[PDB]
Amino acid sequence: LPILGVLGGMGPVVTAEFLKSIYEYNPFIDKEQESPNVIVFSFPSAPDRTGSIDSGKEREFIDFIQVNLEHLNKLADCIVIGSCTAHYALPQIPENLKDKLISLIKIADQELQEYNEPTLLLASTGTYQKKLFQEGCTTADLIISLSESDQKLIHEMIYKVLKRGHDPLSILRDIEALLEKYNTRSYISGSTEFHLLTKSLKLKGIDSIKAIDPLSTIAQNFSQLII
Amino acid sequence: LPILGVLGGMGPVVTAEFLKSIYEYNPFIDKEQESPNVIVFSFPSAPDRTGSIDSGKEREFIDFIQVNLEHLNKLADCIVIGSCTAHYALPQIPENLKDKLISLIKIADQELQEYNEPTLLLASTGTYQKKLFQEGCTTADLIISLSESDQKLIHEMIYKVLKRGHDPLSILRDIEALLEKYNTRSYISGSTEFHLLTKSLKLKGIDSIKAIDPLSTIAQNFSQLII
Numbered sequence: 001l002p003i004l005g006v007l008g009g010m011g012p013v014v015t016a017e018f019l020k021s022i023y024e025y026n027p028f029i030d031k032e033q034e035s036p037n038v039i040v041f042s043f044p045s046a047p048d049r050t051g052s053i054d055s056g057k058e059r060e061f062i063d064f065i066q067v068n069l070e071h072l073n074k075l076a077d078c079i080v081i082g083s084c085t086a087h088y089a090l091p092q093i094p095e096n097l098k099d100k101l102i103s104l105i106k107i108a109d110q111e112l113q114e115y116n117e118p119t120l121l122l123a124s125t126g127t128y129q130k131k132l133f134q135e136g137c138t139t140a141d142l143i144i145s146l147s148e149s150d151q152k153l154i155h156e157m158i159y160k161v162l163k164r165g166h167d168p169l170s171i172l173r174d175i176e177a178l179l180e181k182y183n184t185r186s187y188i189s190g191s192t193e194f195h196l197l198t199k200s201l202k203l204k205g206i207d208s209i210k211a212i213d214p215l216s217t218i219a220q221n222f223s224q225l226i227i
Numbered sequence: 228l229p230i231l232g233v234l235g236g237m238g239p240v241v242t243a244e245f246l247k248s249i250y251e252y253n254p255f256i257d258k259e260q261e262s263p264n265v266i267v268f269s270f271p272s273a274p275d276r277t278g279s280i281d282s283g284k285e286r287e288f289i290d291f292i293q294v295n296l297e298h299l300n301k302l303a304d305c306i307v308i309g310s311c312t313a314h315y316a317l318p319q320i321p322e323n324l325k326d327k328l329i330s331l332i333k334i335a336d337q338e339l340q341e342y343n344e345p346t347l348l349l350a351s352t353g354t355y356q357k358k359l360f361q362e363g364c365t366t367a368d369l370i371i372s373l374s375e376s377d378q379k380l381i382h383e384m385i386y387k388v389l390k391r392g393h394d395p396l397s398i399l400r401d402i403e404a405l406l407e408k409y410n411t412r413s414y415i416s417g418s419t420e421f422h423l424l425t426k427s428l429k430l431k432g433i434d435s436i437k438a439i440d441p442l443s444t445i446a447q448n449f450s451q452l453i454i
């Protein structure tokens with residue numbers, strides 16, 4: 001049976017919610033034995049991803065990812081790293097440990113190709129500095145980049161509200177204002193913590209905003225993707 | 228740093244919620260790097276626990292638990308099996324693979340000793356047939372046992388409502404009636420799926436019912452317990 005391995009804890013709140021999403025969007029018919037098989041390494045002790053870029057110590061962070069990719073390679077058939085920023089480490093990791101990897105950047109790119117309208121990348125100065133989406137996506141010309149100021153506001157929302165487990169709807173007004181400012185009805189979850197916003201929007205039936213949210217997509221398409 | 232290993236998927240919904248509880252009751256102060264380190268094996272493909280008792284095939288189930296205890300022994304410092312019924316397998320597992328195990332039966336027993344009033348065991352004919360609580364608890368004389376009829380009603384709630392991700396508050400009226408019938412203000416989560424009820428009661432501020440819920444306790448006391 002196909003096992004998904006999740007390298008998460010980046011952050012832990014969104015990692016737990018992602019595991020919840022997997023079973024929410026893959027409810028069984030008769031027996032639980034149908035449901036997704038998942039291994040989650042939720043290690044918050046991973047060095048901060050943006051923090052490792054802003055200081056010297058990217059080597060420390062790449063080692064964390066490399067060791068845990070070795071573990072999950074043996075245990076799982078497909079692997080997801082529960083942080084977009086964390087994907088910056090991948091050029092340094094050997095090709096053999098990335099065969100089973102499903103890239104959050106690629107999953108985003110696929111959904112944006114289908115959607116085919118301009119979309120606001122919500123991230124994370126670290127993700128922006130590393131240019132993961134601009135360098136990774138075939139659809140890069142459909143990605144609207146936040147200004148440096150609004151990147152810092154998004155960083156504040158992530159760390160002050162989302163990573164702390166607070167109600168993701170509390171930032172919805174600020175997100176709507178950004179969406180209006182940049183003249184778009186959609187966002188990309190460039191930070192995985194926007195999985196938490198995306199879920200709260202779907203729960204309240206707010207369908208005015210189009211969320212290109214890789215973790216939602218992975219959860220929804222688990223049976224198709226996990227081979 | 229201390230790692231909790233969770234052998235779950237029994238069921239998957241409650242396993243995901245348990246991981247959520249860990250980070251809800253251990254919010255960080257400054258940095259995420261403070262937060263609990265957790266490995267979750269969520270394998271719904273484990274044979275049904277009551278089902279393995281009601282047919283011949285307990286050996287199949289004990290093997291599942293044994294193999295995954297070997298995995299988690301190498302990876303984690305403490306281990307929890309996210310099913311009370313599943314603890315029936317432990318007499319057959321070698322002593323070396325259970326050194327790091329935190330028993331849900333024992334955690335329940337500890338809380339019931341402190342609470343020291345009669346309490347209704349909610350389970351699971353399989354858990355009742357195996358007598359895990361009656362044989363495991365020093366506080367067995369404080370455990371009120373459901374009749375065989377009400378055991379089947381509890382089984383219906385677990386499988387028809389709780390394991391399917393439906394609103395746990397939908398069974399609250401039936402649970403209050405049982406609590407009144409058996410003349411008590413407290414229950415034990417003899418099934419781990421009552422972690423889901425316990426959370427919904429705490430969320431709505433309903434403090435009339437005392438929930439002896441091992442997964443809540445483990446989440447709350449993570450720093451104390453996980454060594």
Ligand SMILES: N[C@@H](CC(=O)O)C(=O)O
Pocket residue numbers: 010011049082083084085086124127190191192193
């Ligand atoms: N979860 C965020 C930041 C982090 O890795 O902590 C991201 O995917 O960019």
Ligand SMILES: N[C@@H](CC(=O)O)C(=O)O
Pocket residue numbers: 237238276309310311312313351354417418419420
């Ligand atoms: N989670 C329930 C039943 C199961 O194992 O599926 C219990 O702990 O008894």
